[PDB]
Design a protein around this ligand. Structure first.
Ligand code: TRP
Ligand code: K
Ligand code: K
Ligand code: K
Ligand code: K
Ligand code: K
Ligand code: K
Ligand code: K
Ligand code: K
Ligand code: K
Ligand code: K
Ligand code: K
Ligand code: K
Ligand code: K
Ligand code: K
Ligand code: K
Ligand code: K
Ligand code: K
Ligand code: K
Ligand code: K
Ligand code: K
Ligand code: K
Ligand code: K
Ligand code: K
Ligand code: K
Ligand code: K
Ligand code: K
Ligand code: K
Ligand code: K
Ligand code: K
Ligand code: K
Ligand code: K
Ligand code: MG
Ligand code: MG
Ligand code: MG
Ligand code: MG
Ligand code: MG
Ligand code: MG
Ligand code: MG
Ligand code: MG
Ligand code: MG
Ligand code: MG
Ligand code: MG
Ligand code: MG
Ligand code: MG
Ligand code: MG
Ligand code: MG
Ligand code: MG
Ligand code: MG
Ligand code: MG
Ligand code: MG
Ligand code: MG
Ligand code: MG
Ligand code: MG
Ligand code: MG
Ligand code: MG
Ligand code: MG
Ligand code: MG
Ligand code: MG
Ligand code: MG
Ligand code: MG
Ligand code: MG
Ligand code: MG
Ligand code: MG
Ligand code: MG
Ligand code: MG
Ligand code: MG
Ligand code: MG
Ligand code: MG
Ligand code: MG
Ligand code: MG
Ligand code: MG
Ligand code: MG
Ligand code: MG
Ligand code: MG
Ligand code: MG
Ligand code: MG
Ligand code: MG
Ligand code: MG
Ligand code: MG
Ligand code: MG
Ligand code: MG
Ligand code: MG
Ligand code: MG
Ligand code: MG
Ligand code: MG
Ligand code: MG
Ligand code: MG
Ligand code: MG
Ligand code: MG
Ligand code: MG
Ligand code: MG
Ligand code: MG
Ligand code: MG
Ligand code: MG
Ligand code: MG
Ligand code: MG
Lengths: 118, 56, 123, 209, 114, 17
RNA sequence: GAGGACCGAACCGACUAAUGUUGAAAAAUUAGCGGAUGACUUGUGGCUGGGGGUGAAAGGCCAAUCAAACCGGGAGAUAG
RNA sequence: CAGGUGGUCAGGUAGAGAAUACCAAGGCGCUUGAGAGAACUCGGGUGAAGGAACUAGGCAAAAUGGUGCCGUAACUUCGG
RNA sequence: UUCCUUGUCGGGUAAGUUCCGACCUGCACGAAUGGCGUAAUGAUGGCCAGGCUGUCUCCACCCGAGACUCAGUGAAAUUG
RNA sequence: GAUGUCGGCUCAUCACAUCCUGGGGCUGAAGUAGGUCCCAAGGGUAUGGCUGUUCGCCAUUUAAAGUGGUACGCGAGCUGGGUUUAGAACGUCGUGAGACAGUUCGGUCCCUAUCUGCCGUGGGCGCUGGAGAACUGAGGGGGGCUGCUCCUAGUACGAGAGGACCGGAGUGGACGCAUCACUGGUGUUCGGGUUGUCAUGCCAAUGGCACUGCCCGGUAGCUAAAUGCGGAAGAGAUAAGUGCUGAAAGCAUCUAAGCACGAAACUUGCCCCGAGAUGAGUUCUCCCUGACCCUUUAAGGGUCCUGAAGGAACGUUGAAGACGACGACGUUGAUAGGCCGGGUGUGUAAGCGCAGCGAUGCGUUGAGCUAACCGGUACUAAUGAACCGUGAGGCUUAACCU
């Protein structure tokens, strides 16, 4: 049974999941479009979209709290100086997933995840 | 465990009656580009439903 | 939730200090005895000049368990340890003359009105 | 007698003034619309077919829509049937409400139980597990033996083995009726009924005692 | 679940006081020794509180006649006649289950003073 | 070779004396 | 500052259990276990040869082979 | 190819330490991947009340575990 | 070492074919193929207690690696 | 040119020569409790100590702790204590090597399932135009156990001691089904405390690693030890048994003719599956009303035009799920993610200020954060299409209508 449970496990233990989405979240903020497997792009939306509503209100307390979840001051600065104001009026849904072909090496289904006003 | 008699070439082909692949029924045609693609997938140069989503 | 081999303290002053459960009476394949349930015990240690000697086989009635009793509205009463009162083997009447500690209202029955009266506190 | 079709809303408790807590299930019984009546002449048995709920006009097919339009009834979640006793008559289009159970004391509730998936013989059939230790080799929750030697040299039909558990029709019998709430379309019964929240329940007065 | 919520509100008491873990309370409950009702009081330390609407409950611990006793009360039950806070205790926790292994001077809770 | 250790193990092999 | 002393890593072993049993491995791995200045352990070289060697002794070991090694021959032994 | 293989070199913070934990210099992620999140198997974590009732047998697990000081029986070959 | 034999008696347990103490009717002990004791020692055999526990009453949930589906490569025993 | 052994564990299944429960006859049957025989196989039918044990003795239960078959059921299901290899010793026998249904200590248990079987779950085709639903029920399976207390009643019975049948109510044990409101377990996806070390320039604040580092709490879900329900009543035909009327046989006689009772066994009644029930059933609704050519002339083949109802695919997914399947939804939209509000859990964040030599305490402050929950909201993704599916559906006979 798995009833009413949420969260992809992605064939990794918990600490390797926690650290892998922390890298992707930094990479999407910095490049504004990346290419991933479709299961890992749908699980990214629940990590990087809460980071953007956090950045909509600048304070020392929130910056120190976006830092505990990205561990990258070059990412925290972009969130609070560009992606905060840019999505100021949008209420949720800062990200768009687009399916593309299949990865050659192992036939994984691919997708492009980006920020909406890229 | 292992077989006691050699299974024939009819029992082999009956088992493989479910092994066939299914072709894609149709390919959608892009609104502006006019090129085929899988439905719900971007085309081969980044058009999806008219607009150009991947300017690469 | 008393079963065989469970060690119980003694709530009366029969002399015993620790007893072991060796059977849950009242049915075939019966697992557990709760508050108000008669059990067959054996005495594992006694005080030097009591009425009961170590090694005796007697009956007892459970009066406190730390699994607890559930009341009609959903409440629970749990204690810090399991306790029993020693009974005569045939008449099933108390052997001692005092009860220590609180008891509960699941003993309020025609058999154990002797115990209810003696208890310092009934919950 | 006939029953109604409801919907498992949830479970809660009712406190009585004398300090007893009753676990109740809340069944939400809207109006059931009679959409077809069967008779011995045409069908060979007596029954009514009822519908309940609402459905979006987009998802009703042409054959389904034309069956409701004949009765003059607006579409519903599904269609169920109850067998009529002797002396009960119902007419097409009328509505049946939860006040039917006003003086009923006990009910029988049917629903589809929670789906457990492929389950083992320890969960499904209450088999005992074997030793955890003491030398056991890869056989901790496995079934054990499944038959005898050369006589009879086969496994008997109906042997208890692992397979699909749950997700199937179940009936619970002789449940009390703690309260009928006709103004809110509610029916509180005492205890637990099969299915998960939001499932469809069928409620009939108890056939037994 | 507006349907369930409505059924819940009609049964809740409106006068439950505010307490938190560590406090000392009297709970007066109704007992029925045969055919006459009566109140008897339970004194102890609130060691746990469960906030669930009508399903709320709290656990009180006392030492009675040399035996420790825990009682879980359903807050909105009609059996609980009244709850009365006697002392306020300062704790850092939400559930004080470590008080099960402490007796005498080791199981002392300090007053809150505010 | 010859083994198939369970064709050499003589608890398994020498089972009926 | 003695000791076939003590506790304990490297090092040498192999008491228990689980895994593996067409293995990752023709004897291992994991977790614990014993000795650990000595009748210890290890590198390089040397000597003992088949009814023979060597053996704190188990018929143990002598190139994955041991109640008589391996290779070639007698030899196409003989086979109610 | 989860085995075997002699010698030399020997940083920091805690530590008695070449143990153990995290790091430096330096070196690597072990040559199939992507999903899903059934029974069962393997390796682990937690568990109400009871506490060896399990079993051939407390097997296996759990528990104990350090430094300083106080205290320590029978028996003895006078060292334990 | 004792077949008869679970000898009988005592102890320990609610209950003890094992254990400990005795008795002597030693099938079929016995004095360097040594007898009877023995402190310390033993990955030695038997038995009992305390602590501790998923060993068990009686299992439940969770974390990973397989098992399952997709793409790639691709065996084996066995067989009138 | 191999059919693995005793006991244990797991899982059973049949017989009836019946252990309990059910029904009866006789009793050296007053009552309670028995003895013995007949009918009856629906369900039920102990836990421990000792021993390798099956057995047995013993302790304590139970309504009872049945007797057997199944390769003395079951090792391609587990074990490996015993017996039954190689080591060693004792007693005894032998000059000896050695031997012992004498004892004692130690001692490697393989298999990825082709076929039948069984448990689940799909694809194809059929059911005679196509499609969407609701049914009937041939048949098949599941279930079936019982204690104690009270009333009737200290009545019937008996000198007393003792103490009922029949009938009713209540409450339990064991077993099964469901469920998560409660009481709890879990909760490596939530909050906190804390040890060592490394890093973010440093302080403050945080992160990585140490089994989730070690711990303390805990949401949803799953779950039991939690809490609801169940076993029936009734009917039919009976077994053993008991009869009524009644001759053969002037009587008698349950039987020959005729009539009646009679049990947990049987057929129903309760619960689930079920039209591949090829004997392929019924009911309701919806859709299709175009030409032409050819031949070997018939349920024939072909061309153009047409493409319905519906379905599948694809996408967003689920209290559904190994994969299929099943359910919900696809802009005329709450399907999922985010977002907004709440709840819940943790337990008074950071920053700043004040008191203190400092650790630290206090105030702002029940603060900050909060997973799977509840109530909302088109912000993001669920596309205009394309695909499959046709174009009124055979012959004979009958009954009506033209
Ligand atoms: N079974 C084990 C040990 C073993 C090796 N050779 C054997 C010969 C006979 C018996 C056992 C063995 C293995 O395969 O590794
Ligand atoms: K079950
Ligand atoms: K020295
Ligand atoms: K040397
Ligand atoms: K030789
Ligand atoms: K002898
Ligand atoms: K004795
Ligand atoms: K004794
Ligand atoms: K000696
Ligand atoms: K030894
Ligand atoms: K010893
Ligand atoms: K049998
Ligand atoms: K018979
Ligand atoms: K009988
Ligand atoms: K009789
Ligand atoms: K029977
Ligand atoms: K015997
Ligand atoms: K075996
Ligand atoms: K066996
Ligand atoms: K076989
Ligand atoms: K076959
Ligand atoms: K049956
Ligand atoms: K709870
Ligand atoms: K929970
Ligand atoms: K740290
Ligand atoms: K913990
Ligand atoms: K007569
Ligand atoms: K019955
Ligand atoms: K059909
Ligand atoms: K799976
Ligand atoms: K603060
Ligand atoms: K809060
Ligand atoms: Mg993988
Ligand atoms: Mg870690
Ligand atoms: Mg499910
Ligand atoms: Mg299934
Ligand atoms: Mg093995
Ligand atoms: Mg195992
Ligand atoms: Mg046959
Ligand atoms: Mg030494
Ligand atoms: Mg060592
Ligand atoms: Mg060696
Ligand atoms: Mg070893
Ligand atoms: Mg090792
Ligand atoms: Mg040691
Ligand atoms: Mg050492
Ligand atoms: Mg030396
Ligand atoms: Mg030898
Ligand atoms: Mg060779
Ligand atoms: Mg060799
Ligand atoms: Mg020779
Ligand atoms: Mg010759
Ligand atoms: Mg030859
Ligand atoms: Mg290598
Ligand atoms: Mg080395
Ligand atoms: Mg190291
Ligand atoms: Mg480096
Ligand atoms: Mg798993
Ligand atoms: Mg426990
Ligand atoms: Mg806990
Ligand atoms: Mg505990
Ligand atoms: Mg035992
Ligand atoms: Mg046993
Ligand atoms: Mg051990
Ligand atoms: Mg002593
Ligand atoms: Mg000394
Ligand atoms: Mg004795
Ligand atoms: Mg002796
Ligand atoms: Mg001798
Ligand atoms: Mg001699
Ligand atoms: Mg002599
Ligand atoms: Mg001599
Ligand atoms: Mg001696
Ligand atoms: Mg697979
Ligand atoms: Mg493949
Ligand atoms: Mg061959
Ligand atoms: Mg053969
Ligand atoms: Mg018979
Ligand atoms: Mg034993
Ligand atoms: Mg057999
Ligand atoms: Mg077999
Ligand atoms: Mg063994
Ligand atoms: Mg053995
Ligand atoms: Mg020998
Ligand atoms: Mg022999
Ligand atoms: Mg095996
Ligand atoms: Mg097969
Ligand atoms: Mg039927
Ligand atoms: Mg039937
Ligand atoms: Mg809930
Ligand atoms: Mg809890
Ligand atoms: Mg936890
Ligand atoms: Mg700092
Ligand atoms: Mg690091
Ligand atoms: Mg049909
Ligand atoms: Mg899906
Ligand atoms: Mg709306």
């Amino acid at each position: 049974m798995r009833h009413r449970k949420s969260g992809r496990q992605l064939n990794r233990n918990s600490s390797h999941r926690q650290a892998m989405f922390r890298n992707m979240a930094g990479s999407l903020v910095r490049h504004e479009i990346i290419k991933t497997t479709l299961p890992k792009a749908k699980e990214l939306r629940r990590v990087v979209e809460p980071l953007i509503t956090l950045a909509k209100t600048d304070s020392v307390a929130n910056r120190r709290l976006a830092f505990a979840r990205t561990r990258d001051n070059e990412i925290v600065a972009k969130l609070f100086n560009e992606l905060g104001p840019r999505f100021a009026s949008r209420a949720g849904g800062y990200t768009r997933i687009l399916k593309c072909g299949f990865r050659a090496g192992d036939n994984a289904p691919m997708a492009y995840i980006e920020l909406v006003d890229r | 465990a292992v077989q006691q008699n050699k299974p024939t070439r009819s029992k082999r082909g009956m088992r493989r009656s479910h092994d066939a692949l299914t072709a894609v029924t149709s390919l959608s045609v892009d609104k502006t580009s006019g090129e085929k693609h899988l439905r719900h997938h971007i085309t081969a140069d980044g058009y999806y439903r008219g607009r150009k989503v991947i300017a690469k | 939730m008393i079963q065989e081999q469970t060690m119980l303290n003694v709530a009366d002053n029969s002399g015993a200090r620790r007893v072991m459960c060796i059977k849950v009476l009242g049915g075939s394949h019966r697992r557990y005895a709760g508050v108000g349930d008669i059990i067959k015990i054996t005495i594992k240690e006694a005080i030097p000049r009591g009425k009961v000697k170590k090694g005796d086989v007697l009956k007892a009635v459970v009066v406190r368990t730390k699994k607890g009793v559930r009341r009609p509205d959903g409440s629970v009463i749990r204690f810090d340890g399991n306790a029993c009162v020693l009974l005569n083997n045939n008449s099933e009447q108390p052997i001692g003359t005092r009860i220590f500690g609180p008891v509960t209202r699941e003993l309020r029955s025609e058999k154990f009105m002797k115990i209810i009266s003696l208890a310092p506190e009934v919950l | 007698m006939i029953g109604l079709v409801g919907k498992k809303v949830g479970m809660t408790r009712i406190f009585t003034e004398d300090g007893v807590s009753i676990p109740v299930t809340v069944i939400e019984v809207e109006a059931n619309r009679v959409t077809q009546v069967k008779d011995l002449a045409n069908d060979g048995y007596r029954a009514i077919q009822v519908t309940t709920g609402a459905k979006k006009a987009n998802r009703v097919t042409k054959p389904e829509a034309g069956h409701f339009a004949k009765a003059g009834v607006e579409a519903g979640r599904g269609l169920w049937e109850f067998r009529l006793a002797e002396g009960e008559e119902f007419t097409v289009g009328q509505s049946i409400s939860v006040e039917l159970f006003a003086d009923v004391k006990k009910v029988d509730v049917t629903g589809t139980s929670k789906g457990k998936g492929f389950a083992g013989t320890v969960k499904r059939w209450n088999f005992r597990t074997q030793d955890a230790t003491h030398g056991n080799s890869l056989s901790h929750r496995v079934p054990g033996s499944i038959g005898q030697n050369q006589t009879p040299g086969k496994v008997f039909k109906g042997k208890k083995m692992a397979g699909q558990m749950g997700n199937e029709r179940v009936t619970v019998q002789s449940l009390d009726v703690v309260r009928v709430d006709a103004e809110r379309n509610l029916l509180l019964v005492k205890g637990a009924v099969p299915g998960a929240t939001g499932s469809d329940l069928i409620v009939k007065p108890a056939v037994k005692a | 679940s507006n349907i369930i919520k409505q059924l819940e509100q009609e049964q809740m008491k409106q006068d439950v006081p505010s307490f938190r873990p560590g406090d000392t309370v009297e709970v007066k409950v109704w007992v029925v020794e045969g055919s006459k009702k009566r109140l008897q009081a339970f004194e102890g330390v609130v060691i746990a509180i469960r906030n669930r609407g009508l399903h709320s409950a709290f656990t009180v611990r006392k030492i009675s006649n040399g035996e420790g006793v825990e009682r879980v009360f359903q807050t909105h039950s009609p059996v609980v006649d009244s709850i009365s806070v006697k002392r306020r205790g300062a704790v850092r926790k939400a559930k004080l289950y470590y008080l099960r292994e402490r007796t005498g001077k080791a199981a002392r809770i300090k007053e809150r003073l505010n | 070779v010859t083994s198939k250790w369970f064709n050499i193990d003589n608890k398994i092999v020498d089972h009926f004396p």
